[PDB]
Structures are given as structure tokens and as C-alpha cells.
Design a protein around this ligand. Structure first.
Ligand SMILES: Nc1nc2c(ncn2[C@@H]2O[C@H](COP(=O)(O)OP(=O)(O)O)[C@@H](O)[C@H]2O)c(=O)[nH]1
Ligand SMILES: Nc1nc2c(ncn2[C@@H]2O[C@H](COP(=O)(O)OP(=O)(O)O)[C@@H](O)[C@H]2O)c(=O)[nH]1
Ligand code: ALF
Ligand code: ALF
Ligand SMILES: [Mg+2]
Ligand SMILES: [Mg+2]
Ligand SMILES: [Rb+]
Ligand SMILES: [Rb+]
Lengths: 160, 161
């Protein structure tokens, strides 16, 4: 199954791709617009194989390559079986994704299931782990420190 | 199966080749040098023979930090290749010997690593497509943009590996 990592620039999408991959598969920097190309990694949880797909942070970009990467990111979303909507927790205390970015949520294919991932729990102090908002799955992790990425691994097995 | 790494200077047509081999638009291609930075890996098959194709950032002295980093990762894939396709923009030089095109690059490769010199953009130079040899290296003239000469590459990849 195709699981697409998507959200704003600098949310930590590539860190999570790397954590899920177990491998420095995507470049990771604090410069917004680091990922432009779509990056795919084939993994296996527990007998369940999936493609995890890292994408350019969504925005209106004047960098042409990034502009193209954002086109393709939306195209990956269109074909996704699940989106992991990645949020930098330090930027908002909001947990309902309609409060975080309604425009993005509203644009997503109807009934494409969304897992909301409040990342950088290491700066927030947020309590780690899974819950649910407005019927959307909600995982609090650190992609950088691996802290709580395990629950997400199990979540994917369960839900897919 | 084995790992084929596409390497060379920026804008040589390495992503264009990856997409022609993969039969789909895996890598972003533009006229802008420094488009590719992350390493892109595609798994393909030729005549049933499985093959890994790795696209890399063009090697240059880059001002952009993400690109500098992709260049490092590009080298770290090269070190680990079973073959390198050394892609050269044909309209930039009439040279065929990789030693005349970029000696530094050629010398830094691991001792055992074979290389196929690919002279890309043959649609512009008008050079005859197909296979030859320079100084013991395999040599191929093709257009990744049009796909002309790429079957010769595919056949060379199956025979060579
Ligand atoms: N402190 C902390 N930083 C993170 C975490 N995840 C990502 N980052 C950092 O935030 C910046 C952007 O990360 P990256 O994965 O490349 O973001 P992307 O643009 O969404 O893919 C980098 O400096 C990362 O090291 C996290 O869980 N905790
Ligand atoms: N005329 C011609 N143009 C090409 C060919 N291959 C690539 N290009 C163009 O050269 C530019 C750089 O190509 P790209 O594949 O992104 O280069 P890379 O930086 O080495 O990956 C783009 O404008 C391509 O369309 C070719 O065989 N013929
Ligand atoms: F801002 Al990014 F990958 F570098 F979304
Ligand atoms: F210049 Al490139 F991939 F964009 F080597
Ligand atoms: Mg990224
Ligand atoms: Mg390229
Ligand atoms: Rb980034
Ligand atoms: Rb390019």
C-alpha cells in the first residue's frame, strides 16, 4: 500500500521517511524546500509490505524545481492509500487538522484516510503516542529522535 | 540485481536517462543545473534481468547547501556501484576519452569499477548512435531526451552484467 508523507515545508517529512526506512534515504536540513523530487522507500512492518513516499513540503514556490516537486506531491496524494499529515508541533498547539490547515485537508481526495502526526515532540514536551481527533488518527512522535515512531509502525499495520 | 549509477556533470542528462530507462518520469528534469540533489533509485528489468539504476546530483562546485550535500551522496553511491554510467553532454566537448573529459573524476573511482562513457545529446551533435570503445571503456552515443540509442544501452547493460 502507498503511504504518502505530506505537509508544510520543514515539518520533518524526510526525517520520518529516514526513521521508517532505517537509512539516510532523504536529505534532511532546516532549509525549507530541501526535498523536491519524490522519494520512495519500500519497507515491511510485520509481514505487511508498503511503499512510503516522501514529498516536497506544500506551498506556492518560486523555486521552479520545488514548484514541480509540489505538483508531483499532489499527484502522489491522489494515488495514496493513506496520507501522513506531518505537522511541526512547535508551530501550533492545534490538534484538529481543520484548525492546522483546512485548505490542505479540504483538497484531499474524499475518504483518503488521514493520520495526523504532530512531530518534534522533543521540543514541545507533548506526551507521546496515539489518539484521535474528529475521527482522524493522531500520533505524537519525534522523527529525529525516533521517540514514538514505533506506535506509528503498529498503527500502519492495524489500519492498512 | 546489480547497481548502475548515473554520474557526471550537472545538466548532462542523467535524470533524462533515468526516466528513459525506467519508462516513466521518476526524476524531475529541467534546464536548471542542480535539479537533482537527493539520490533517486529506480528498480528496473531488462529482458527479465533485474537492475538497480541510481540517479545522482551532477558533480560541480555548488553554491547551494542542499546541492553540495547531494554531491557528497552522489560520490557515496559511485563508490558503491557495480558500474558507473559516466554521462557527458555531447555538445560540450568532442572528446571521447574519459581522461580528456574529466581526469579527476575518473581517477577517484574505486580501482575495480567499470565505466560506460555515455555521450548524451546525440540528437544535437548528429553523432552516430550505437556502441564503441575508448581506451578499454565501453562508449555509447545516445539521446536520453528522444530515446535514440537507449536500446543499445539497455542491451549493453544486459550483456555487461
Ligand atoms: N527537534 C526535532 N527536529 C526535527 C524533527 N523532525 C525533523 N526535524 C528537523 O526539522 C528540520 C526539517 O526537517 P526535514 O525532515 O528535512 O523536513 P521536511 O522539509 O518536511 O522534509 C531539520 O533540521 C530536521 O532535523 C524532530 O522530531 N525533532
Ligand atoms: N537535446 C537534448 N537535450 C537533452 C538530452 N538529455 C537531456 N537534455 C536536456 O538537458 C537538460 C538537463 O537534463 P537533466 O536530465 O535534468 O540533466 P541532469 O542534471 O544531469 O540530471 C534538460 O533541459 C533536458 O531536457 C538529449 O538527449 N538531447
Ligand atoms: F521543506 Al522539505 F522536504 F525540505 F518539505
Ligand atoms: F544538474 Al542535475 F541532476 F540537475 F545533475
Ligand atoms: Mg524533506
Ligand atoms: Mg538530474
Ligand atoms: Rb527541510
Ligand atoms: Rb538539470
Amino acid at each position: 500500500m502507498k503511504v504518502v508523507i505530506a505537509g508544510r515545508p520543514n515539518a520533518g517529512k524526510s526525517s520520518l521517511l529516514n526513521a521508517l526506512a532505517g537509512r539516510e534515504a532523504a536529505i534532511v536540513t532546516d532549509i525549507a524546500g530541501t526535498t523536491r523530487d519524490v522519494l520512495r522507500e519500500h519497507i515491511h512492518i510485520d509481514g505487511m509490505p508498503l511503499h512510503i513516499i516522501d514529498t516536497a513540503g506544500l506551498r506556492e514556490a518560486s523555486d521552479e524545481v520545488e514548484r514541480i516537486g509540489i505538483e508531483r506531491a499532489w499527484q502522489e496524494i491522489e494515488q495514496a492509500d493513506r496520507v501522513l499529515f506531518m505537522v511541526d508541533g512547535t508551530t501550533t498547539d492545534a490538534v484538529d487538522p481543520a484548525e492546522i490547515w483546512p485548505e490542505f485537508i479540504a483538497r484531499l481526495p474524499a475518504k483518503l484516510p488521514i493520520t495526523v502526526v504532530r512531530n518534534k515532540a522533543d521540543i514541545t514536551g507533548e506526551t507521546l503516542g496515539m489518539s484521535e481527533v474528529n475521527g482522524h488518527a493522531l500520533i505524537r512522535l519525534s522523527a529525529r529522535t525516533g521517540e514514538g515512531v514505533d506506535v506509528l509502525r503498529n498503527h500502519l499495520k492495524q489500519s492498512m
